[PDB]
Amino acid sequence: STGSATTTPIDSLDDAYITPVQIGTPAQTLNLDFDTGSSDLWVFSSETTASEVDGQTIYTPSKSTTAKLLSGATWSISYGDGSSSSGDVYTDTVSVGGLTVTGQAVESAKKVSSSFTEDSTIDGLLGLAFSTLNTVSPTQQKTFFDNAKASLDSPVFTADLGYHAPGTYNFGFIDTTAYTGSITYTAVSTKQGFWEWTSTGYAVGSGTFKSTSIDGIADTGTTLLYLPATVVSAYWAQVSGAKSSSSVGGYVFPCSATLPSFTFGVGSARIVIPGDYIDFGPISTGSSSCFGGIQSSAGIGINIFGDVALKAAFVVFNGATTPTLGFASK
Numbered sequence: 132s133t134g135s136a137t138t139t140p141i142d143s144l145d146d147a148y149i150t151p152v153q154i155g156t157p158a159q160t161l162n163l164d165f166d167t168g169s170s171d172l173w174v175f176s177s178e179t180t181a182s183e184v185d186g187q188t189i190y191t192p193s194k195s196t197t198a199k200l201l202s203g204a205t206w207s208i209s210y211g212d213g214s215s216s217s218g219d220v221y222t223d224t225v226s227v228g229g230l231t232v233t234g235q236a237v238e239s240a241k242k243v244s245s246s247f248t249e250d251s252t253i254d255g256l257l258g259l260a261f262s263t264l265n266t267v268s269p270t271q272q273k274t275f276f277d278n279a280k281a282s283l284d285s286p287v288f289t290a291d292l293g294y295h296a297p298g299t300y301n302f303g304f305i306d307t308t309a310y311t312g313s314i315t316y317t318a319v320s321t322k323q324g325f326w327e328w329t330s331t332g333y334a335v336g337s338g339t340f341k342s343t344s345i346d347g348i349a350d351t352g353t354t355l356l357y358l359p360a361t362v363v364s365a366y367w368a369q370v371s372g373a374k375s376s377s378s379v380g381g382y383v384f385p386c387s388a389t390l391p392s393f394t395f396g397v398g399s400a401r402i403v404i405p406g407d408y409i410d411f412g413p414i415s416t417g418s419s420s421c422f423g424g425i426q427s428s429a430g431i432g433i434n435i436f437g438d439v440a441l442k443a444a445f446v447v448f449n450g451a452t453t454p455t456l457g458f459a460s461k
C-alpha cells in the first residue's frame with residue numbers, strides 16, 4: 132500500500148503545515164499538523180473543554196461506528212514551545228492520502244493550552260517520531276507510520292514541504308520526480324525517540340563551507356532552524372543591523388535587508404536554504420524589525436532542523452530495521 136496527501140501552509144509565513152486526515156466511519160476529516168518530532172496522534176474532540184475550542188474541527192467518536200474507547204488509557208504531552216494537551220484515547224480507522232490504518236490510537240483532547248486554542252487552522256497533531264515517545268499510559272501506543280509500516284510497499288515516508296506553497300507527504304514510496312540529483316542518506320540515532328542525525332557542516336551565503344558535526348533532529352512540527360550559538364552568530368553577522376533581542380526572544384534584522392542563504396551538509400552533499408526562507412516578517416504588525424528563521428538552540432538542549440531547513444529539501448524518513456534519513460535538493 133501507499134498514501135499521498137497534500138500539506139498546506141496555515142498562513143503566509145509557513146508557520147506550520149496542515150494535512151487532511153480521515154478519522155472514523157463515516158469519515159470525519161480533520162486538518163492535522165504532521166510532526167516528525169513527536170509521537171502522539173491527538174485531536175480536538177467532542178470531549179475538549181468548550182472554552183478551549185475556537186474554530187477547530189472536532190472529532191466526535193460517538194458518531195463513528197468504528198470508534199472504541201481504549202479503556203483506562205490517558206495521555207498528556209508538552210511541546211518545546213510550552214504548549215500542551217491531554218485527554219483520553221479511542222481506537223478508530225485513520226486514513227491519510229488513501230492509506231488506511233485500522234485500530235489506530237486517536238488521542239482525544241480534554242484540555243489544550245492557549246496556543247492550540249488560538250490556532251483555529253490546526254485540528255490536532257499526527258506524530259511521526261518513534262513510538263517510544265508516545266505518551267499514552269498505561270499501554271504505550273504506536274504512531275500511524277509504525278502501524279502502517281508492514282502494509283507499505285517500502286517502510287518509508289517522505290516530506291516535501293513547500294515555501295509559501297503546498298507540498299506533499301507520501302507513505303510507502305519515494306517519488307523520483309519530486310527531487311533533483313540524488314538522495315544522500317545519513318545515519319539516525321533513535322536513542323532519544325527522534326529522527327536524530329549529524330550534519331557535516333554549514334556555510335553562510337557564498338562563504339566557505341565549515342566542516343563540523345552538528346547533531347540535531349529532523350522536525351516537521353518545528354517552524355524554524357535552531358542551531359548552536361556559534362553557527363547562528365556567524366550567520367547573522369552577515370546581515371547589517373541584525374541582533375539578538377532578549378525582548379523579542381531571538382535574532383531580528385532590518386526588514387530592508389536581503390538575507391544570505393544558509394547551506395547545511397548531509398554527508399558530502401549540501402542543501403541550500405535560500406535567504407528568503409529565513410525571513411519570518413515583522414515582529415509585530417507594521418514593524419520594520421523582522422524575525423529571523425535561524426535561531427540559537429542553546430536554550431533547548433537539542434539542535435532542530437525544522438521547517439526552514441526541511442522545506443529546502445526532499446526528505447526521506449526511512450523506517451527500515453536500521454532507520455536512516457535521506458535528503459535531496461529539489
Ligand SMILES: COC(=O)COc1cccc(CN)c1
Nearest residue numbers: 147210211212352353354355
Ligand atoms: C510550530 O510551533 C513552533 O515551531 C513553536 O516553536 C518551537 C520551538 C522549538 C520546538 C518546538 C516544538 N515543535 C516548537
Ligand code: NA
Nearest residue numbers: 379380411422
Ligand atoms: Na514567533
